[PDB]
């Protein structure tokens, strides 16, 4: 039974664990706990074949910088995540994450993934961002970064509403072939 290894990396608290958990069990984490490491498995068949989609959650916090790479060997596709309502996480995509995965896995493709898109229209987060003279990252801006960083492409979703959630993994699968 052929397997596909998908690894999710990105700043702490941007939504990596929630999108994985929501996608695989359609439930939503009740509280927030920074993860150390975790990996689930789910089966799919976009080609009439029963493939095993191995999903690896990683720690976004820098404290685990030395432990995180242990999940990288044999990766088929990476999901580099950033919160569309958190500019700083978006900037770390090019300052930290893409560099890290391309240092460990030069040949492995990866998709740029925007998360928490449901908050783009949330009043309090828009206001919060405005007080700091900022605005949610726009798909156009992210798509540009994907092109510059040579990502397979950009995709976004919401682990809360699941809007776009499945398409994120459908593309990951597609890119892992």
């Amino acid at each position: 039974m052929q397997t596909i290894k998908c690894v999710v990396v990105g700043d702490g608290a941007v939504g990596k664990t929630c999108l994985l958990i929501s996608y695989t069990t359609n439930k939503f984490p009740s509280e927030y706990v920074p993860t150390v490491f975790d990996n689930y498995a789910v089966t799919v068949m976009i080609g009439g074949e029963p493939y095993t989609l191995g999903l690896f959650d990683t720690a976004g916090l820098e404290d685990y910088d030395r432990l995180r790479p242990l999940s990288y060997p044999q990766t088929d596709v990476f999901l580099v995540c950033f919160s569309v309502v958190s500019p700083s996480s978006f900037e770390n995509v090019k300052e930290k994450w893409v560099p890290e995965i391309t240092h460990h896995c030069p040949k492995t493709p990866f998709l740029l993934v925007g998360t928490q898109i449901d908050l783009r229209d949330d009043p309090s987060t828009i206001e919060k961002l405005a007080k700091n003279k900022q605005k949610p990252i726009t798909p156009e801006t992210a798509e540009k970064l994907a092109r510059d960083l040579k990502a397979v492409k950009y995709v976004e979703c919401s682990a809360l509403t699941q809007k776009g959630l499945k398409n994120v993994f459908d593309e990951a699968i597609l890119a892992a072939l």
């Binding site: 958990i21 439930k27 984490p29 949330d122 309090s124």
Partner: peptide, 17 residues
Amino acid sequence: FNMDKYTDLVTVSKPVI
């Protein structure tokens, strides 16, 4: 914060490390 977006929702509690 429209906190209702988090109450009207099916949650779970995975194991912690």
